[model samples]
Target chain A: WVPHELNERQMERRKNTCEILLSRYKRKSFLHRIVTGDEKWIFFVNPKKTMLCVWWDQSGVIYYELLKPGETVNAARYQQQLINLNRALQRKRPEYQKRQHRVIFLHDNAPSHTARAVRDTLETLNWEVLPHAAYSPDLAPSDYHLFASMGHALAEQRFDSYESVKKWLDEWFAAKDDEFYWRGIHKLPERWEKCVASDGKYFE
Target chain B: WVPHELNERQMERRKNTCEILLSRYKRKSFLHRIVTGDEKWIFFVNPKKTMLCVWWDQSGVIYYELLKPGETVNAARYQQQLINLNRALQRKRPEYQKRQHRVIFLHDNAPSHTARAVRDTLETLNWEVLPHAAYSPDLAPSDYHLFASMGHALAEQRFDSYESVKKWLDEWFAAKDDEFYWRGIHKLPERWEKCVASDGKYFE
Candidate 1:
């Protein structure tokens, strides 16, 4: 088929277009002045089984049923599921606008958030997306708050139906307060400040 | 100027007399319920810096304050400070009652909560005293919800004035919602269930 490499002129034109887009859409506000931008959600089917979907500017999560019990989730379907979650989050823009200024989406650079189709959707949503960094449990509040608390809360509990799991989910959501939710959100500001303080190197 | 030991017969007689007095005067109805007890503000203070008092319940944090710089606070004076907080909390009993079933005082084994004088004052107010088991963070929501989060929020940030500290403290308190507070209280059911499951080895 087609060659993998772009010709010299094609590369120059692509670079110029990217430069133009960057100049036109660069962030105008400083750190403190910029409203909070990061949003993350952690999903779990049960205590031992979980997945995290993050986004920088926009993201979504989707689901699919499998015929076989205890079958591993298809990697392709998981990516699509994340894209769906990103879409759902974007659809709730009115809710986000009520809270702060510009919203920047932060997510891991997983195949889901970075897929060409997912990136295209985010671009269409006019979101300022941050690059997906590597994943780390300690640095992510979803792990610290959602997973840690859920692990302790769900220990030794068994579920027989999806409805039962849904009920547990509702209880879990009911048990959490805005403080817990905001703690995860507020971590971003601290993370950004710490990043600046450390000259972009994360401190332990 | 009291002796450390008393004669066995005299001690037994005194214990009987005290038990009789407790049966006659102690509010049995208040002790039976979790929140119906007499309301008193219990303060947990960090002695290393400006004395900061956080008032909480089995539910969640209600109020907190940082003493004015140069304000003198010692073990003896701290008890009086608690009396003030207790009065204020008592005044707001109607407001808190709507949110919770009862109002029980929660405090650690700190000498302040356990002092004979403090116990006498609590009894006078008809407050039921509940002592927390040693080294149990799971039982204390303030450890996870308020203190731990506040410590993380204020990490590496300098506070030049008590007012600034108070402002931040206020922000932290305001950020919490009813759900966060309830989660702490809701854990009691699980704690009880776990205790029952463990044949009473889990809860003290």
Candidate 2:
């Protein structure tokens, strides 16, 4: 087990990201361009692997990528996911389709995310990955903001099988209005700043 | 009357307060001891004065003090307010009455709030006043979180009289469970840290 002495380098990176967000280019300009996506485990003995995506604005979900049964996202598969994501986004959002509208991508640091294959695709797609604090799960918006609401929708709600859970996940995500997604996305800037200020400490 | 050219001193003070919150006396140990109170602008006749107090952990409002019309808090009046607050807490939450539990008093550094009389009273009472930055109305929890929700409760909703608004305010505060109060109080430490980290910039 890890003693978890506050990782100093992670703290430094958080601070860097926070200050960058404060910059005008990063604040106003980049917000319209921020596309945050993260994976969550969905279980009903239901292979719980799914990725949910949203933009920083009131614009709602871009897509939810459901993973195949008995499978996990490896570097190659994730790269393929990104490739599909780019196509889906450009087709759906006019702003995303434009060449100048490069986005700030926010996600927790995952080994699969850090893979060169994933990085290459993001670069090819002209998306810049925002610096996320390493090793801290609480640092992600999906963890603090979106996950709880999902939990509420799922709590005490039994799934008959994996298919039921999948149906529920789809219904739950669809049922959440623009306000729900907006509230979740609204937290990042403030959180990023606080993480830096608190010397990289995590928050709920 | 104010174009508000970001007075340099105000920014400096915000930075100063942010570090203080990040320090030993401000983080975990301080949550139990934190007792934030601030006057709110309540309206049904523009009779805009009220005070709300809370400790971090509790989901309920510790106290709510309704002020009479045109009765702005002066130094002596503010002192009276805290004395009443102190007595109220002891009568209700016994531990608050003892030296073993000194509370952290958070309010904006307004003229009355910073007046010698108010300072002396807090010291004599043995409660610590957080070093909030000046000219920063946005810095208070009451300013952002509580007031915003209160506004939502009152928005476009007609209040026939003071009693109605009073009735509504009570329900609003009471209707908000512990999680509501806890979330409101929880923002301070991080807000403080971010305020410092961003050199006093306000965050959403």
Indicate which candidate wins on TM-score: 2
Give the alpha carbon lDDT tens digit for every residue of A1-204 in model 2: 112345577567766766776675454656666677777666544323333333233466676665655467788977887787777788877877876577778877678888987888888887878777665545566666676556545544666665676687677767878787776667666766676678665542
Candidate 2: fnat, from 0 to 1?
Answer: 0.00
Instruction: Give lDDT tens digits, candidate 1, residues B116-171.
Output: 77777777655555555443343455554456555555643466665667776677
Query: How many clashes show up in model 2?
Result: 2
lDDT of 2 by residue, B109-178 (tens): 6678889988888899888777767655566666566765665555546656657767877787777777
lDDT of each: 0.46, 0.65
Error at A59, model 1, angstroms? 31
Global CA lDDT computed for model 2: 0.65
Cα-based lDDT at residue A183, candidate 2:
66
TM-score of each: 0.38, 0.47
lDDT of 1 by residue, A18-67 (tens): 34433434454222211122122223344323222222221211122212
Off by over 4 Å in 2: A1-5, A24-29, A45-58, B1-204
Give the CA lDDT, 0 to 100, for residue A16 in model 2. 72
DockQ of 2: 0.02
